[PDB]
Design a protein around this nucleic acid. Structure first.
Ligand SMILES: [Mg+2]
Ligand SMILES: [Mg+2]
Ligand SMILES: [Mg+2]
Ligand SMILES: [Mg+2]
Ligand SMILES: [Mg+2]
Ligand SMILES: [Mg+2]
Ligand SMILES: [Mg+2]
Lengths: 59, 55, 94, 142
RNA sequence: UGUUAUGGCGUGCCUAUUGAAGCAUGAGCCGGCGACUUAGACCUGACGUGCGAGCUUAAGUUGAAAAACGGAGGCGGAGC
RNA sequence: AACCGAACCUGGAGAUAGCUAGUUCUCCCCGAAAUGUAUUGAGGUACAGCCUCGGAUGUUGACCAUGUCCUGUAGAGCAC
RNA sequence: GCGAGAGCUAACUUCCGUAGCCGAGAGGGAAACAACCCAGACCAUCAGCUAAGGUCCCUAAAUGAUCGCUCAGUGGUUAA
RNA sequence: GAGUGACGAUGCGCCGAAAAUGAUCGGGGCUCAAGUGAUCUACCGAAGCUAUGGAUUCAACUCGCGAAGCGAGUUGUCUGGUAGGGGAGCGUUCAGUCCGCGGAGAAGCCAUACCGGAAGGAGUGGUGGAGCCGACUGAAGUGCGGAUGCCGGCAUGAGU
RNA sequence: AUCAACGGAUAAAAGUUACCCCGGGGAUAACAGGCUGAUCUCCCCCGAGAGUCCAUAUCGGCGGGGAGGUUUGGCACCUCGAUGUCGGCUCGUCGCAUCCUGGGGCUGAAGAAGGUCCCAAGGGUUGGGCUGUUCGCCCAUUAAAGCGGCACGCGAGCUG
């Protein structure tokens, strides 16, 4: 259910689960994993920050 | 020599399960530092495919 | 979470895994992995710059569940009890 | 602990079938109908958008329209009650060609069946504005 | 706590079998009834106690709101 | 005397039943066998093999290496 | 599966040898599916990594990236 | 006025290709690859490995106690399971002993969200209307879903 | 001591049951299904030769490759606490490897009559004599008097 809500938001900012989680892995600093879906669901502004951070650590 | 059990003993011949026991490995993931002697090197060659061998 | 939380919370009394530090006070500090306590959207290690303080409230046992196991025509039936040990912590933190 | 439900939001969407290969258009519709970006994101209930389809008649099909693509409706007790149309032969009811690709990619339960009620197909262009008195945000495929 | 809607998952039980949701057996349901026991101075082993290079008594006699007596005999003690 | 290749009733009698069925509270530890020889034996049974519990011994067991002996298969060959 | 006999180099056939699993093995995969692939479940969690398998939609996760091939729906029934 | 032809090799495809209820690769659908050879990361994915808590088995290392032996106590380790073997216990009746309870309400019945690792065991209320828990030890006609099981009551077929 | 049934039951021993009985077995046969496909049915490759001449209009030696699952079997998997079994009748429906009609190509097709192959399952496919017959032979017709599946379709539908 959580994975589903994740690439639902990741795609909203032109990403996806496979890709978004890889960036958050590459930015080691991010170890969120659990409750990364609450951020995606309740706080869009805050979720963007994570999408932006993932995009960087990847490219 | 750094050894780690990456594959299960289930479905593998008796001797290969007996070797993995001699190497001191009980679970997948079990890693251990190993001796560089013909007998200890031989055991590791005998279950080569079930193990991730470093150097 | 997986023991030892994180995140911007508004000072709530949440229940987690056992903490050893008996009775009230005890006091616990948590690393923090993301926050919005001041609109600042900071995450990972840069969040480690911050640390949340929480006070131990109550030590407890969870609701009684029953471990029921069954395999057909092999006469196998198993009934055993279970209660999960916990710690309630009041968040205060920076 | 995970996030709960809000429903007082029914989003209408307009999708154009022109030149789009059936299956590929179908995927998009079937996904917006169930929940892609998903409002509350929960599967327990129907969160998807309403999908209006235009130019159903102009949908694209690869190697076989007249060949192989065969609808196979097999009627009441089979006293040879085995009826079958070709895809070119759906110059009769083109609004069904989209429908059967979309329902085909949807869950088959009680809720699933209640989902086709959100798919409104029309064979024309500027005229299908029938079920278009509410909002009608246009979404292109890819 | 009771109930409900939708979603996921999900092949009664027993028996018998290499193999049971099986279209193999049994059973309408509930209540009650219903299947490893007892005997023997029998053999052999575990555990426990009492005495210990020794250990016991049987029938019986006498007492009995109760146990004492009774060494006939039995076993260890040497084997081939 | 409403079922006669030997009537009915009561007894021997709880006949026998290598066969079918059934075999009831709980949790914890270990954990098989469908093989070998024999059997008026072949869906039965004896001994072994394999399980478990107590004891004695307590590294003899296991795998892998080195050394050493043994073998006529795969291949191959046409000397029999 | 491998090595053979019987058989028609049939059988979800039979009979030996050998390794594994099922038997007595839940969990993922193979649509479903004892056996095949992965893997051996002490209990709890609304944490994380992987295996075999997977990543259009039903259905978790790339409608990935590069160079190619095949236009038969071959892929999604075998031969001379 | 420009290349043209014959053997062969090998990749993918074509024909050869007819079966009985309705068809399909699981489906939708796919070549505007979602087919297929080679390569490369990334993610999903189990009761496998990991995190956190907790219980058990055995073992060694501490200490209680006149001694084994058994408690607790860490650390390591173990815990799929049919026949079967071994261990620890729950429950019922009867008995002996102790402690009690009861017409200001016994047993039994009924309801219940409490407790214990299980068998199980309490609290409260309701009903009942005279007997009875708890503990230690002893003894058994001692635990049922099955046996076309036995006895009894009541259902279905059916307002047929 | 041919105790030779050779680990040898008594010193001492044959049959029959459709008059049969009990305990069992789907551990095991008959029916049917299933797997297989030798046999069976059909189709295809090659081309000796038959065809005045010309292998292929028709026919196809020796040989070869498949398909089907309607035969006889093989095997023994669910069913022996029961899956009624041939033929008739009744009622149907399905496959096509088409008996008639419909469309075609080749013909050793002048025409009329045909032979053979391709496409084609919409409808149609007669009444009697003999036999329990399925079949088959016969009478008399016909556009034709197809072949096979459905537990050798159908007995809680009938016959027997
Ligand atoms: Mg039976
Ligand atoms: Mg009797
Ligand atoms: Mg061949
Ligand atoms: Mg009963
Ligand atoms: Mg048969
Ligand atoms: Mg018969
Ligand atoms: Mg019938």
């Amino acid at each position: 259910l959580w994975i589903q809500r994740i690439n639902a938001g990741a795609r909203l900012h032109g990403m996806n689960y496979s890709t978004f989680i890889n960036g958050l892995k590459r930015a080691n600093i991010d170890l969120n994993r659990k409750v990364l879906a609450d951020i995606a669901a309740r706080e869009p502004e805050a979720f963007k920050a994570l999408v932006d951070a993932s995009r960087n650590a990847r490219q | 020599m750094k050894i780690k059990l990456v594959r299960s003993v289930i479905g593998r011949p008796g001797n290969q399960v007996k070797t993995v026991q001699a190497l001191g490995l009980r679970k997948i993931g079990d890693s251990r530092e190993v001796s560089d002697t013909p007998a200890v090197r031989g055991m590791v060659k005998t279950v080569k495919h079930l193990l991730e061998v470093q150097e | 979470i997986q023991t030892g939380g994180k995140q911007y919370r508004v000072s709530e009394g949440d229940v987690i895994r056992v903490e050893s530090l008996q009775g009230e006070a005890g006091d616990k500090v948590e690393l923090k992995a993301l926050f919005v306590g001041g609109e600042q959207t900071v995450f990972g290690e840069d969040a480690g710059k911050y640390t949340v303080q929480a006070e131990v409230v109550e030590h407890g046992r969870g609701k009684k569940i029953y471990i029921r196991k069954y395999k057909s025509g092999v006469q196998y039936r198993r009934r055993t009890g279970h209660r999960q040990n916990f710690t309630a912590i009041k968040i205060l933190g920076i | 602990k995970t996030y709960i439900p809000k429903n007082d939001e029914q989003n209408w969407v307009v999708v154009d079938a022109s030149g789009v290969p059936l299956g590929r258009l179908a995927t998009l519709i079937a996904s917006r109908i169930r929940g892609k970006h998903r409002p509350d994101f929960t599967p327990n209930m129907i969160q998807g958008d309403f999908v209006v389809v235009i130019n159903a008649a102009q949908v694209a099909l690869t190697g076989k329209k007249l060949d192989d693509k065969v609808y196979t409706r097999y009627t009441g007790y089979q006293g040879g009650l085995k009826t079958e149309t070709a895809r070119e032969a759906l110059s009769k009811h083109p609004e069904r060609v989209i429908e059967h690709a979309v329902f085909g990619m949807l869950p088959k339960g009680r809720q699933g069946r209640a989902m086709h009620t959100r798919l409104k197909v029309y064979a024309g262009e500027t005229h299908p504005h029938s079920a278009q008195k509410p909002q009608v945000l246009k979404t292109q495929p890819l």
